[PDB]
Structures are given as structure tokens and as C-alpha cells.
Design a protein around this ligand. Structure first.
Ligand SMILES: Nc1ncnc2c1ncn2[C@@H]1O[C@H](COP(=O)(O)OP(=O)(O)OP(=O)(O)O)[C@@H](O)[C@H]1O
Ligand code: SF4
Ligand code: SF4
Lengths: 136, 118, 608
RNA sequence: CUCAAAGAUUAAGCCAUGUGGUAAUUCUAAUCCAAGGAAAGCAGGCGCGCAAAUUACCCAAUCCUAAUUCAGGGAGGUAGUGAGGAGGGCAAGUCUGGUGCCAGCAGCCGCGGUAAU
């Protein structure tokens, strides 16, 4: 979360600790995203920081265009897999872990998002809304 | 606006391959098929419009429906269909049984009949 | 290497007096020091001229100018590619033009000074584009070449040959009364002559526009809304292929502007080409198939974008940014208070404000009825409804300007009032007038942001009000009402003559002062968005225009909006991205579902 | 003047436009999305590069396609656009002013360090 995130976010189950790799779901040239940090996460001895739906992470691209590899950039988690629970009572989950590469302000690097996108992320990051097909 | 299609079952929409000779698809070219969205044949509140046909009349009159009555645009043209729409025998000779539609030129009112076939 | 850039200088002659400064521009410029050409003196008109070729882009001259007469900007050579026409040296230049298409309606939207008016003339054949050059003696031939690569090229060949003669509904709303009297004699005469179409067309067109009463009146006599509509009538009646409308929503009320939009669209059905320019988004959305956005600084330049979709163009407009152009055309984004956002106070003040009983005012040709309502302190009430309903009459009675036929409202309160139609009738200059009302309001920082800096009143200060302009005068009047202290303030139709940025400056103005000062305000309006921002309650007027009317007590925002919008029968669901009203078509399932819920509009509120 | 080649080489790279419901299709009982769903031919543009034209007119001709006519056809046809040398090999003696192994010439051979074929 943080910059450019207009909205607050209700807690959702943390799915992705540091080291996790999600699918890159944009058209940027990136094939996956390797999580090295979660923004706005706190501190407890021994705890991995771990992201969830609509969290902004800091990632590198393990697989993808060489102009994207070997460096750290912001991304946003768009699909989960660890099931979480909404305030309408529902426990839900996607089939994959996936997020999209983005700028500190929260602008997509790419122009499409392939696959669905959870609403809690859509609601959080307007330029993600824009590029989303099926939401939730 | 997607049309229902008898026989699907489903109260949802689905996309089907459609062919010559079928509902919700009119082909542009010989042997063309199109994959098209279509609505299920099961009524839901997702419908803008239900299409009903009256089968039995109720106890009371509905104005634009029972009160009003509307002429069948065109009459029999083929020989034996004239024979049937009048019950005739292959004796009676058609020609003077064909329909005759009056229509005016202003001060010249005319009279047009089909052109019997078979 | 580095990207490419340019310099463009535009100087306002009104602002410039070389005597006081001296031709300081030449002396201070570093290029001229060296012996270069950047600023040349024109002995004739006695004006400074700045050549764009030799200028450095230093901006030294701009700072030195005592007034603020010179403006130099640096662009990435965005403007140079597109040059259509320029008025003269160091003046407004137009860039790109809007595409016309047959069988459809193409919209145009922009802030004032963009050249939307100019663009119409060029398409009309009234003015020939110079092409940012000499082109003058009818050189239509060169214009097609300039347009090559654009769809307008075909249109320009058509125009030169004069196969088509476009019909234009004139833009300047203030200018029209002077030009025509009668049309010659009375509106009725105009409609009979112009009617190339059906005899049905005379009757039908009048009925839909609500022109029935107005036929006997003369054009000069007409009120602003009436004046607009007669022009629209003539643009349907005419026989032609191309019908150009330039700002058809001006002066019109909320009900009427929607009506105008439908009728204009009917032209597309006969497959006649239509073009239209609008300041109103509600109106623009309904009319158009395709939309162009015009952007750039006012009076400096204005470029037309490539053609876009109806939905798409509107969405981009509200962002305040355009990607290809990469310009943030508007400094701040428009937002509406949620109503969660507002401050929470227990309101009464002295226990509630004053209250008015039933009132009636009858002219003898029109009758107004008012239902007893109450007003409270520190609140804001919107007044909506069609003109001729007695929205204006009601406010006057509260002002004490008018005496009620029945009912009475004698309050102890001090009232400040702003009239609806503003025509100058005060001798004196602008600064003198505003200073008499209150100085010190002029000192405040709020007033610098909203009035003084945007327009540049400093230059206006010497100018006469008779000599003045429409929109500029409007912002000044609204501010003046706020100039003096009063328990209650009354404003009538602040949106007139104003573009997008201008109105929204006003919206912030009324809400902020009222909240702060803890005073009450009544505002009359046609603009949906303006009412929403300012108000807490609303009064809706109903009845039939030019006949009778009725008023209601104040009711909550949700309640009042449902009633008003129910009269129109257009729902404005919500767009998820823009949070904008999204219009809903008649007979529908989604729209039908809403009718059963009672939601005409949506905001960041709970609701299905 | 008559005859007319023409964006293939670069990138088979990318392309603007020419009784009822429904956002909308010639609806049917990588683009537009009322979020549901629906969609390397002429000209002309971008790009690319060393490199290739007009958004025109027409069925008259040549023929073609549909049934007993004379419909259709950017197949086709008309127009628009669209031609250095004077040291030698080379043939000219090169002559007069400026330049000095600076500026420049020179396909090779070679010219050029005030008197330059
Ligand atoms: N006679 C003129 N000489 C010089 N510049 C002119 C002249 N007439 C218009 N302009 C310039 O063209 C621009 C204006 O007009 P147009 O009439 O094209 O505006 P619009 O785009 O219709 O704007 P508005 O909404 O304010 O009516 C102005 O900003 C002005 O600088
Ligand atoms: S523009 Fe300013 S500085 Fe230049 S002559 Fe005019 S008043 Fe003087
Ligand atoms: S900007 Fe600079 S360079 Fe250009 S006109 Fe002014 S002083 Fe001269």
C-alpha cells in the first residue's frame, strides 16, 4: 500500500512471504515477480514480511525480458491463492499467485492485465481498475 | 438484449456455434457459422422482456388484444390451397375464388388478385 | 540527444503600454544586446513584437515587464506539427480541427478561448485558414494539403466546391439580440420562412422545444433561454446536410437542455452530418457518437485531439490529463465531497434560522405558489427546476425586492443578493465598484486564488463594465455578493457564461465561506454537479413553465435529488472509474431495477 | 514531342477512413464496450530506410461475372503525379587575382613549403 493508494484496506490473510514468486500478469515482458519486500509491513523478530491482495511489494523479475531482469521494482499483488475472508462472510481464493509491475505512485508499467483481478486490489489502485477485465 | 433460445435449459447466457436454419442467427454466406452469445430458455429477473402467447382466454377482456382483431395480410395463391381455404372439389374452378384487393388511384379505384400457381 | 523544444511568445496589447515601460523589452533582452532580432519594434501600431526564431527562451523579458504583458513558454514542439491558423503576430493560433461525419453527431468540449468557435467558422466556410501563414486570398487549395493525413481533407474539398453550405447556429449568446430584431419581426416570422421541411415541422419543432408562448414575442424581448431555442428551431427547419451547433446549452434550464439534445440528435437519423460544441457533460454525452477534446491555455492556443468514443472521451476529460499529448491540462482534479467528508456539527445557531410562510406571487399571467419551509443557520439550500417556474421570483421575494401578492416575509436579517442575468448598469470601473462593496475581502488569499490571479482583474481594473466580457463579469459578481457581511446570502444561477474550471472555482467558494462564517446561503442552479457540492438541502420546483409553478420545503440531498431526477426520468447509475453520473436509457432492466430502488445518482455512499 | 516505371530490395513490418427487446453489429425473438458481451487489392498514413505518386473520373474501349437485362466490376481504362570538366589517363598550352603541406582538390597517378598548368 502507501503512495497513490487512495482508499484504506481491510486486513486480508497474508499469502506471500518474501521469497515467494508470483506470475507476472501484465504485458510488460516480465514472466514472473520474486517478492523481496512488502511495503508498510511491520517488525517482529523472525517474521517474514508477507504480502496479500492489493499490497505493493518490491520485486525483481526472475524470468523475462533482459531489460527488466537484474533489478528491483515495485509491483502490486492482484491474485492470491491463500484463501482469505471478506466482510460478507466469504472465504475465496484464486488459482494462482500474481501481481503486476508498477511505479511508486502506482502506475502500471504495462497496459493489459491478463486473467482476473480481486476487487480489493481494483478498489485500491485505479490504474489497475483501468486495465482489468473480469474483477473478482 | 440477447434473445432466449428454446432448448438450452440454463437461466444464464452462453455462447454457441449457430448454423443455417436456427434461432437467433441469420447467416450472411453459404455454410457460414457464427459463435454468438445467447440467453437461456429459463426465465430470470435478468430479462428485459418476456414473450407470451395466450392459450386460454380468462374471465375478462384485455383491450388491445381481445377487443381488437386483425386481418390476415395475404390470401391463398396456389390452386389447391384456394381449394382448401374454401373447400371446393377439383370441379369448382378457382379464378372466381381468388382474393381481390381494392386500392385507389384517387378517382380510379382498382382491383388486384394474385396469379394462381399449380 | 536532448528532445526538441521551441519557444512561443504571445503578447497581449491590452496589457502593454510602451510609454511607461519604455521599449524596455528590447533593451533588457540579451539577444538584442548581441545585436540579434528577437524583439523588433514596430513603428506603426507601436507594439513590441517578439520573433520566435531568435528568442532564447530566457524569460528575462517576462519578469521585467511591469504589467505582465509578455508570456514565453517552452514546448516540446507539440504545437508546431499541428498549425491550422493564427490570428496575427503574437496572438491566438489554432491547432487541429474536429472531424465531421455524416449520420452522426460529433461533440467538442474544452475551456473557453480554445478555438472551438474558430473551428466552426473554418468548417463553415466563413473564414479561411491562413495556415499560420500568408494564406488569405482564397487559398482553400492549400488547406486541403495541410489537412492531408486527416479525414478533414475530404471535407475541405467539398467546402471549396460549395456543394454543401453549412448552417451555423451562432455562438455568442450576448451578441444575438443586437443583431436581430423581429427575426425582422417576431420569432414566428423566422420559423415560417426558414421552414424548408414539413408543415409538420413547424408545429412539431415548436411543441418539443416549448416555444409555444414565445412565438409572439420579438427576439430582442426574449430572455436568454428563449433566445437560444429559436436559433435551434431554425437549424432543424433549414434544408442542408451539415448542421453546426455551437454551444446549444447556454442560458437554458435543466429540462430544456435535455430536450434540445434529443431534437438535435434526430438529424443523425436522417443521416445528416451534425457537429456540436458543449460546456455541459450531461448534454454532450447524450448528443454525441464521437467526441473531441480541446485543451491548452486560454487565448494562447488550443489543440483538437483525434476523434474518440463518447464514453472514452468523457472519461479522459475528467482525469485532467491526456497521455499522447502528455499534458496536465487542468491543475487540480475535480472532486465532490462525499458527505462523509463534511464537518459534523450540531446545527441551529440561534435555534434555527428564519422561516417563511406560504407565499404567492401572481403576475396575472403566471402564478407562483410556495409551501411553507424552514431555513436553518449555516446551511445551504439548492434551488432547481426549469426557468419560468418562478425560481427567480422566489429569491426576489426573500430579497425584499418583490412584494408578495399574498404571504409576507419581513425578516430582521441583512441580505446580500446576486442577480441572475447580469447586464451592466453601473457607471464606474471594475475596481472602484468592488472596493466600495468591501476592501479587505480583496486582501484575502482566498480571493486571490479564485478571482484576481486567474482572470487578471488588475488589467480589468481600468476597463469599463460596459466594455467588459460575459464570463469575466460573472465571477466578479458572485465574489461581490460575498464581499459584504450578511446573515443570509442569495445567489441566482452562478453557472451562466462559465466553463468547467470557472464554475468549479465558484463551487469551492460558496461552500468554504458559508461553512467557515457560519452563515446561510441559497443558490439557484441548473448544473447538477454544482448543486451537489454546495448544498445540504434542496428545494425542487415543478409545474408548467410560463404558466404556474410550485415550490417545496427544503429536504435532504438524497430525498430532493430523487424527486428532481424522477421528473426527468434519467438515472445517472454510477461509473465505477470516474465516479461520474452514468446516464441510463429509458425502458431497461438495469434502469428498471433502479426505479424500484429509488436511486437516481450514486456517490461514495452505501446503497444497492 | 510522343512512349510512361513506379514503395519488391529496408520491415510477408503496422495500419485511420473511403407484438418486441436490446450498449451496440448487415443482432434478431488487436478494436467498441450500459461490465453484460460484440466484432501482400485502389487510394491514403505510419514506419522503415539509399531508395519509389492522388484519399481523383468513368464504364467509353477490353472483356469478364449473374438470368432472355444491360446490372455489376478501383479487374480495366482516363486523367494527376513523375527529363560537369579545363595537369596527364581524357580534351582542353589554360590565362589573371586570392591562398601558402593552413583551407581544399584528387576514382587511381598525384596536387598544394608566394611567383599553384
Ligand atoms: N480577431 C482575433 N484576433 C486574434 N486572436 C483572435 C481573434 N478572434 C479570436 N482569437 C483568438 O482565438 C481564440 C478564441 O476563440 P474561439 O473563438 O476559437 O474560442 P472557443 O475556442 O470557442 O472558446 P470560448 O469557449 O471561450 O468561446 C482566443 O483565445 C483568441 O486569442
Ligand atoms: S509590455 Fe510592459 S514593459 Fe514592455 S512596454 Fe508595455 S508596459 Fe513597458
Ligand atoms: S525570452 Fe529572453 S531571449 Fe526571448 S525575447 Fe525575452 S529576453 Fe529576448
Amino acid at each position: 500500500s502507501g503512495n497513490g493508494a487512495q482508499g484504506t484496506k481491510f486486513r486480508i490473510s497474508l499469502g506471500l512471504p518474501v521469497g515467494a514468486i508470483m506470475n507476472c500478469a501484465d504485458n510488460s515482458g516480465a514472466r514472473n515477480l520474486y517478492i523481496i519486500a512488502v511495503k508498510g509491513s511491520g517488525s517482529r523478530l523472525n517474521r517474514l514480511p508477507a504480502a496479500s491482495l492489493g499490497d505493493m511489494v518490491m520485486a525483481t523479475v526472475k524470468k523475462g525480458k533482459p531489460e527488466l531482469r537484474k533489478k528491483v521494482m515495485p509491483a502490486i499483488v492482484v491474485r492470491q491463492a491463500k484463501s482469505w475472508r471478506r466482510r460478507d462472510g466469504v472465504f475465496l481464493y484464486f488459482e494462482d499467485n500474481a501481481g503486476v509491475i508498477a511505479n511508486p505512485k502506482g502506475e502500471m508499467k504495462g497496459s493489459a492485465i491478463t486473467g482476473p483481478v480481486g476487487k480489493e486490489c481494483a478498489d485500491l489502485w485505479p490504474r489497475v481498475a483501468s486495465n482489468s477485465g473480469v474483477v473478482v | 438484449g440477447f434473445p432466449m433460445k428454446q432448448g438450452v435449459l440454463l437461466p444464464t447466457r452462453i455462447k454457441l456455434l449457430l448454423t443455417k436454419n436456427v434461432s437467433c442467427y441469420r447467416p450472411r454466406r453459404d455454410g457460414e457459422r457464427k459463435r454468438k452469445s445467447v440467453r437461456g430458455a429459463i426465465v430470470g429477473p435478468d430479462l428485459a422482456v418476456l414473450a407470451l402467447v395466450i392459450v386460454k382466454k380468462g374471465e375478462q377482456e384485455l383491450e388491445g388484444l381481445t377487443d381488437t382483431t386483425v386481418p390476415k395480410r395475404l390470401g391463398p395463391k396456389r390452386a389447391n390451397n384456394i381449394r382448401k381455404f374454401f373447400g371446393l372439389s377439383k370441379e369448382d374452378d378457382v379464378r372466381d375464388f381468388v382474393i381481390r384487393r381494392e386500392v385507389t388511384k384517387g378517382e380510379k379505384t382498382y382491383t388486384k388478385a394474385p396469379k394462381i400457381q399449380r | 540527444m536532448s528532445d526538441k523544444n521551441s519557444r512561443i511568445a504571445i503578447v497581449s496589447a491590452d496589457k502593454c503600454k510602451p510609454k511607461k515601460c519604455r521599449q524596455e523589452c528590447k533593451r533588457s533582452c540579451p539577444v538584442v544586446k548581441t545585436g540579434k532580432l528577437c524583439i523588433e519594434v514596430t513603428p506603426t501600431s507601436k507594439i513590441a513584437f517578439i520573433s520566435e526564431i531568435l528568442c532564447i527562451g530566457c524569460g528575462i523579458c517576462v519578469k521585467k515587464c511591469p504589467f505582465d504583458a509578455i508570456q514565453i513558454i517552452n514546448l516540446p514542439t507539440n504545437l508546431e506539427a499541428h498549425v491550422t491558423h493564427r490570428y496575427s503576430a503574437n496572438s491566438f493560433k489554432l491547432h487541429r480541427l474536429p472531424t465531421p461525419r455524416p449520420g452522426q453527431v460529433l461533440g467538442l468540449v474544452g475551456t473557453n478561448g480554445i478555438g472551438k468557435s474558430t473551428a466552426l467558422k473554418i468548417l463553415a466556410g466563413k473564414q479561411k485558414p491562413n495556415l499560420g501563414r500568408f494564406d488569405d486570398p482564397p487559398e482553400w487549395q492549400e488547406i486541403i494539403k495541410y489537412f492531408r493525413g486527416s479525414e478533414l481533407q475530404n471535407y475541405f474539398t467539398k467546402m471549396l466546391e460549395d456543394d454543401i453550405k453549412a448552417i451555423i447556429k451562432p455562438q455568442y449568446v450576448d451578441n444575438i439580440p443586437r443583431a436581430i430584431k423581429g427575426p425582422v419581426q417576431k420569432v414566428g416570422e423566422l420559423l415560417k420562412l426558414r421552414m424548408e421541411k414539413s408543415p409538420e415541422d413547424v408545429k412539431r419543432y415548436i411543441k418539443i422545444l416549448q416555444l409555444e408562448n414565445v412565438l409572439k414575442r420579438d427576439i430582442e424581448k426574449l430572455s436568454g433561454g428563449e433566445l437560444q431555442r429559436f436559433a435551434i428551431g431554425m437549424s432543424c427547419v433549414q434544408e442542408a446536410d451539415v448542421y453546426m451547433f455551437d454551444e446549444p446549452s447556454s442560458y437554458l434550464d435543466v429540462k430544456q437542455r435535455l430536450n434540445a439534445a434529443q431534437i438535435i440528435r434526430s438529424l443523425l437519423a436522417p443521416t445528416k452530418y451534425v457537429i456540436c460544441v458543449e460546456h455541459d457533460l450531461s448534454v454532450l454525452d447524450y448528443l454525441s457518437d464521437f467526441v473531441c477534446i480541446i485543451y491548452g491555455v486560454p487565448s494562447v492556443y488550443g489543440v483538437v485531439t483525434l476523434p474518440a468514443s463518447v464514453r472514452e472521451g468523457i472519461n479522459i476529460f475528467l482525469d485532467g490529463h491526456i497521455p499522447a499529448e502528455n499534458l496536465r491540462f487542468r491543475t487540480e482534479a475535480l472532486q465532490f465531497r462525499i458527505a462523509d467528508a463534511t464537518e459534523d456539527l450540531q446545527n441551529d445557531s440561534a435555534s434555527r434560522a428564519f422561516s417563511y410562510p406560504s407565499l404567492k406571487k401572481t403576475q396575472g399571467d403566471f402564478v407562483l405558489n410556495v409551501e411553507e419551509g424552514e431555513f436553518s443557520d449555516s446551511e445551504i439550500l439548492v434551488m432547481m427546476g426549469e426557468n419560468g417556474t418562478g425560481k427567480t421570483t422566489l429569491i426576489k421575494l426573500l430579497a425584499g425586492a418583490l412584494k408578495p401578492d399574498e404571504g409576507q416575509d419581513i425578516p430582521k436579517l441583512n441580505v446580500s443578493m446576486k442577480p441572475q442575468k447580469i447586464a451592466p448598469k453601473f457607471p464606474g470601473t471594475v475596481r472602484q465598484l468592488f472596493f466600495k462593496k468591501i476592501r479587505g475581502q480583496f486582501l484575502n488569499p482566498q480571493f486571490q486564488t479564485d478571482v484576481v490571479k486567474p482572470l487578471r482583474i488588475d488589467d480589468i481594473i481600468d476597463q469599463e463594465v460596459q466594455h467588459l466580457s460575459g464570463g469575466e463579469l460573472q465571477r466578479v459578481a458572485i465574489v461581490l455578493a460575498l464581499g459584504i457581511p450578511a446573515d443570509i446570502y442569495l445567489i441566482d444561477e452562478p453557472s451562466a457564461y462559465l466553463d468547467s474550471e470557472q464554475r468549479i472555482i465558484c463551487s469551492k467558494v460558496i461552500r468554504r465561506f458559508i461553512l467557515h462564517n457560519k452563515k446561510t446561503a441559497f443558490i439557484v442552479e441548473h448544473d447538477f454537479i454544482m448543486a451537489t457540492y454546495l448544498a445540504d438541502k434542496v428545494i425542487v420546483f415543478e409545474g408548467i413553465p410560463s404558466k404556474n409553478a410550485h415550490a417545496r420545503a427544503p429536504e435532504s440531498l438524497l430525498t430532493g435529488c430523487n424527486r428532481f431526477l424522477k421528473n426527468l426520468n434519467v438515472t445517472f447509475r454510477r461509473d465505477p472509474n470516474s465516479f461520474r453520473p452514468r446516464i441510463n436509457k429509458l425502458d431497461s432492466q438495469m434502469d428498471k431495477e433502479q426505479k424500484s430502488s429509488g436511486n437516481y445518482f450514486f456517490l461514495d455512499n452505501t446503497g444497492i
